Nucleic acid binder design. Structure first.
Lengths: 143, 112, 185, 67, 82, 127, 37
RNA sequence: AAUUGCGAUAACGAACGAGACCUUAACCUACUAAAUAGUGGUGCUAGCAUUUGCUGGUUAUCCACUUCUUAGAGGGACUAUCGGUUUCAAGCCGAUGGAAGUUUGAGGCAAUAACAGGUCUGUGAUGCCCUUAGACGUUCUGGGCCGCACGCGCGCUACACUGACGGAGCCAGCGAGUCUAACCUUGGCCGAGAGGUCUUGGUAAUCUUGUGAAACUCCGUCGUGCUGGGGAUAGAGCAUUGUAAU
């Protein structure tokens, strides 16, 4: 009966954990958040202009806790959008690597994600503890 | 369909599945016309269409009327389809398939 | 002595490359750094050809193909008959089969089967003498098509007689094989 | 139109004309009968012959058919 | 004592099963420890050729582990050439 | 050893292998709860092999589902079929035959897909 | 480019074997892609 | 389904036909068998609540197995059976059992009767214009093969609110991959991106790969307005392959 990330919903976990990271604020947030869209297969920057980066980091940390390890190209593949090419149809386009690198440096600087000797970003046991605790608090929101 | 059954609940029809079945019943053209040869000037003769085809025909007319009504307006597919099923569960001639059922049956009665 | 892998690979190369030059078998002996592969042969005038042919052709083909310089290996030839067309080798084989406990019928079927698989127009094996009985018996085993009169007897059919000594008595093997007249050459 | 080929008709008819009482109304024993009693090279054409023996045995136990 | 894995491939099943069974019989008759013939998936290499048609090829693969000295491995590898 | 039954369940190249062991009454699909299926619409479909028999049939068993292949609808039908198959196979091999017949009758009378594998495959396109 | 018998018409340019569809069905019984279905 | 058979009957035989031969599909918790596939138990190990548990890391920690992946052996289907229809015959149709019941479905295979159908860089004191100042052979540059009142046609993208945008979830399979070369690329840093850097894995069921594809699911922005649908056309720069991108 362990309260963990494996029990909560996806979008609720991302909303809650992004809210905890917003109220903390103790991460590495760049200055091109208001400037740069998350992928070249987009027209407009994300609507949560002051807070889409925390949503991005919450999605990343949730995607890391559930599996062995991730990379930058894997998270570029995960975000991938159907891009219109005008008169040409939609095609799959991977996202920017800079957002992945800065999210993983922000979550590695706080001590949640860590580089694993298979060349991969894995969840730290402190990050395991923190995500399981906030998932427990997300479950306690539901009482 | 789930949104539509919710709407038919909130529009004071406690049995939305019965609203669906009554719209199936009250919008089925019993008899229609076929285009016989007729000797050049091809008249149309009233045949008495099968009740399986009456079910097919009623569902087709309702989906066509709902797709006509929900296209090019703010009003959603669920609200238009619920409006059609409520105005068609009991014959009111403010829906689609009631009117076209009446048109097919009056062509059938005129052409027997 | 070279291995049977090399011998079977030359069998594979010859069976696909000497398809209409009469590749009967391969005799092979190895002296120090010289492997002598004698192509045992149906008809050898396909092998020798017009003024020296298939031996030079296959020698240069192995030197061009199997990356051999002239001087390492050597290719020889000998003139014999086809083992199936010849009544002598088939009579040796019939004597062999009768001396190893195989009866008249299965040995006759095997030898006639091998002759007809070789490519002879026909053959006949005549078996005489006594087999486990006092009374003597003779048995004809003919197949294909044979002729019995005239100058084509001297031209086309080979005959061989063998006295095969068994524990009871002696048997007379008479092998008569008709070679293909189109392949007379 | 599943018309039986000539080999199946003739073989099944011959197996019932000569070898009637061994054959039965059941396909699975007449199949083993056609396995044991005729040299059929393929299982499929043996099944063809055996089921046609089964059908003709169903027909002949009602009355004498022209064998 | 050398542990060598033999990876065999063929197009036809009967000669490949014959070669594998000969490996099994000969490595069993003089007490060699071994893994059984592991049968890889038959890969289906196809070409769509000019309606349209399809050309096919089945490729069958086995592999057998053996543990034997140099003499037995060399005689097995030489004799089993088919 | 905990008494467990290992049983497949397939839908459209989507294989969900189910491990029904003797446990607390715990159900997981791919290490995710049965409350959380990736489509919200198909959710009660996964509840269809559950409530068609009852809920006290489940407290004795810890249920595992691990899935390969398919799509979104295909995996849902695969996991609900695998739940039904693992449940009736547990109640066949360990529990008596009659309860297995009752569970298979309850599954068969509503949806025979939950016990019988499907066949709607994409045909070879007939060159 | 046909490097075998100067037969550019219908090269099969896949995998660099580069045989024309006329001569590819000449040499079809040497590689192994034959008629099954 | 057929000139396939029955039957009457100047009738009596045989061949190629056609059926038929080959190759495929589906069900096999009954075989036979596994570290280039997987599942479970079990060691070492990480987090969470602890009352037993959940999520896992661990190309050897061992075992079992093929339930799923896979190689075959076989098996099965032969219209099995029932009832209409049919000289109540070869057969057809409706229904049941069956993995499969329309010939379970497709394609290759001959013999006989048409192809000047398309060349062989073929041989023959072959016929015949010249025998060569011809380029037929070679080059080497730069423009073409794309040009535009228009006609014949196929496709892509739209005319949106069962929709566009902004997020999230992240579901497959067929393939394919480098040697005496620069293939497929994982990962890490830089860049808004394009891309770049540094390596690493895989000659392959192993790495790319679980190809985390797209459509799809959910939540917010939009509010019917050629609109936030559309993206044609055009400007500016920045990068990549190519000798050379006008």
């Amino acid at each position: 009966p362990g309260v963990s990330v494996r029990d909560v919903a996806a979008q609720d976990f991302i909303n809650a954990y992004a809210s905890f990271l917003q109220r903390q604020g103790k991460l590495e947030v760049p200055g091109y958040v208001d400037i740069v869209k998350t992928s070249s297969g987009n027209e407009m920057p994300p609507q949560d202009a002051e807070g889409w980066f925390y949503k991005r980091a919450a999605s990343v940390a949730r995607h890391i806790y559930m599996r062995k390890q991730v990379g930058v190209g894997k998270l570029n593949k995960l975000y991938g959008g159907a891009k219109s090419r005008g008169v040409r149809p939609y095609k799959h386009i991977d996202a920017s690597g800079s957002i992945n690198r800065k999210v993983l440096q922000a979550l590695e600087k706080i001590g949640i994600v860590e580089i694993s000797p298979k060349g991969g970003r894995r969840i730290s046991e402190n990050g395991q503890r923190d995500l399981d605790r906030i998932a427990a608090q997300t479950l306690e929101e539901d009482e | 369909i789930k949104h539509t059954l919710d709407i038919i609940n909130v529009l004071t029809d406690q049995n939305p599945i019965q609203v669906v079945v009554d719209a199936i019943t009250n919008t089925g053209p019993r008899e229609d016309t076929t285009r016989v040869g007729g000797g050049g000037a091809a008249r149309r003769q009233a045949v008495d269409v099968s009740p399986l085809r009456r079910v097919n025909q009623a569902i087709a007319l309702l989906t066509i009327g709902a797709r006509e009504a929900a296209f090019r307006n703010i009003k959603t597919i669920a609200e238009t389809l619920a409006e059609e099923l409520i105005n068609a569960a009991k014959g009111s001639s403010t829906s689609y398939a009631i009117k076209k059922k009446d048109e097919l049956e009056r062509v059938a009665k005129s052409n027997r | 002595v070279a291995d049977g892998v090399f011998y079977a690979e030359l069998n594979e190369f010859f069976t696909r490359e000497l398809a209409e030059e009469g590749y009967s078998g391969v005799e092979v002996r190895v002296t120090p750094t010289k492997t002598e592969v004698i192509i045992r042969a149906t008809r050898t005038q396909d092998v020798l050809g017009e003024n020296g042919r298939r031996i030079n052709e296959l020698t240069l083909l192995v030197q061009k193909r199997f990356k051999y310089a002239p001087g390492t290996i050597v290719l020889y030839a000998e003139r014999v008959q086809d083992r199936g067309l010849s009544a002598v080798a088939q009579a040796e084989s019939m004597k062999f089969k009768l001396l190893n406990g195989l009866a008249i019928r299965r040995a006759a079927y095997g030898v006639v089967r091998y002759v007809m698989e070789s490519g002879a127009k026909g053959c006949e094996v005549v078996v005489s003498g006594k087999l486990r009985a006092a009374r003597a018996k003779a048995m004809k085993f003919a197949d294909g098509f044979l002729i019995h009169s005239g100058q084509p007897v001297n031209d086309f059919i080979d005959t061989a007689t063998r006295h095969v000594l068994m524990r009871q008595g002696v048997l007379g093997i008479k092998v008569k094989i008709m070679r293909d007249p189109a392949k007379s050459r | 139109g599943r018309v039986r080929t000539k080999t199946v008709k003739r073989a099944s008819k011959a197996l019932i004309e000569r070898y009637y009482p061994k054959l039965t109304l059941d396909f699975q024993t007449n199949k083993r009968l056609c396995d044991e009693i005729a040299t059929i090279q393929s299982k499929r054409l043996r099944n063809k012959i055996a089921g046609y023996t089964t059908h003709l045995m169903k027909r002949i136990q009602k009355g004498p058919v022209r064998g | 004592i050398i542990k060598i894995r033999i990876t065999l491939t063929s197009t036809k099943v009967k000669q490949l099963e014959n070669v594998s069974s000969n490996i099994v019989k000969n490595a069993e008759q003089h007490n060699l420890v071994k893994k059984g013939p592991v049968r890889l998936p038959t890969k289906v290499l196809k070409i769509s050729t000019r309606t349209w048609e399809t050309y096919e090829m089945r490729i069958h693969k086995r592999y057998i582990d053996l543990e034997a000295p140099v003499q037995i491995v060399k005689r097995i590898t030489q004799i089993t050439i088919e | 050893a905990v008494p467990s039954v290992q049983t497949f369940g397939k839908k459209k190249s989507a294989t969900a292998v189910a491990h029904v062991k003797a446990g607390k009454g715990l159900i997981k699909v791919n290490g995710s709860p049965i409350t959380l299926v990736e489509p919200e619409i198909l959710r009660f479909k996964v509840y269809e092999p559950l409530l068609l028999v009852g809920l006290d049939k489940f407290s004795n068993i810890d249920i595992r589902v691990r899935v390969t292949g398919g799509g979104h609808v295909s995996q849902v039908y695969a996991i609900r079929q695998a739940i039904a198959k693992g449940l009736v196979a547990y109640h066949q091999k360990y529990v008596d035959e009659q309860s297995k017949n009752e569970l298979k009758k309850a599954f068969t009378s509503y949806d025979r897909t939950l016990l019988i594998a499907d066949s709607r495959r994409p045909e070879p396109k007939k060159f | 480019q046909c490097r075998v018998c100067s037969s550019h018409t219908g090269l099969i340019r896949k995998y660099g074997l580069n045989i024309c569809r006329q001569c590819f069905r000449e040499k079809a019984n040497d590689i192994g892609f034959n008629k099954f279905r």
